[model samples]
Target: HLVPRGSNPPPPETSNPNKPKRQTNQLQYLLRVVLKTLWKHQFAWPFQQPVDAVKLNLPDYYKIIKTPMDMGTIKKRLENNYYWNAQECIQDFNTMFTNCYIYNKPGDDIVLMAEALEKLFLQKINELPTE
Candidate 1:
């Protein structure tokens, strides 16, 4: 049966108007719970692995790493503005990776395999003629 001539009753609102809004403490508690769960599942103990694990099976490789010089701040020590020296650039790059824990530890298998790559870098550096 069809209701006609505006005889149909209006549907009640599904949401409750009197419902309490989430408090800041409640929100904080929810966020902490989520974060703790994620930390337990993703970053607990000895398995805090990189989020993006990559696998490479290359035969050979060569690399030339470079670092940007702070050209703007170069004139602090010297009146004439210039770029960083080769040693400064290399040292800066190595320091950055080491301090930031980018280098893998020797204990892990992948990190142990990295010893070959480390050897390659050493060999390449050893072969370089002094400038």
Candidate 2:
């Protein structure tokens, strides 16, 4: 199969590149929304940090979240021009939730919000072609 199992594979490499380009934009947009929302509820010891601090800390935080793989295997898929798969994205959410629990000790509201965001992304991925 051209597309790997559990992957949303990008448009055929030989086909018009614009399709994959747009798909990348869509994926980035979704990722940005999810990240932004999670960052908003983030808390630091003593007192909450500024929003800018959250944005600035994301690279390191993401590194921690995507452990073992460093930049993450999902990122590898994207770099290779593959579509962002739902399974990987769901795993990312789980990782983020776990990270939040450990670092921020977030309440149920934040946990539920993260889960809801994950469901939204899953629905979007389900709407895409598996082949």
Candidate 3:
């Protein structure tokens, strides 16, 4: 029998660019939704866009375990302008979205999500700074 070679093995092959992961579509779709929602609500605060407030929102964002969130854009937002309670609101929104129930059937609207989010936000805001 031939003698065995040294223990070092070849480096693992790098990920293929063409053969993308099966979940890429789903992830992209979800990310689109997250970014849109973040932008839509950012106007509620002082931030003009999600990219403006990403930094302040990142900590609370990580606390949101229910959804995979992208904070890069939001961080850019915070670096641009300042807001009083942007961080708090971001966290609240994350919690609300994570806890929200999604309907699988077609024609699902924002009614339910809106109500739940508003109620939860009201409750949370009440517990925060008063003024």
Candidate maximizing TM-score: 2
Candidate 3: which stretches are off by over 4 Å?
Answer: 1-81, 84-108
lDDT of 3: 0.36
Best by lDDT: 2
Query: Which 10 consecutive residues of model 3 have the lowest summed lDDT?
Result: 44-53
- Compared with the true structure, what per-residue lDDT tens digits does model 1 show for residues 1-131? 12223332232122343543332432232224322332343223222221111122111111111222221122221222111233432343233234223334556654443343334434444443334
Q: Candidate 2 on 1-131: residue-level lDDT in tens?
A: 33223332222232234544334454554345433443343331111221122434433443344332211333433455445444454464455445555544455654555455556545655554443
Model 2 regions more than 4 Å off: 1-90, 101-107
Question: What's the lDDT for all of these models?
Answer: 0.29, 0.40, 0.36
Q: What are the candidates' C-alpha RMSDs?
A: 27.0, 13.5, 18.8
Where does candidate 2 clash, by residue pair?
A: 10-83
Name the candidate, 1 or 2, with the larger lDDT value.
Answer: 2
Residue-pair clashes per candidate, as listed?
0, 1, 10
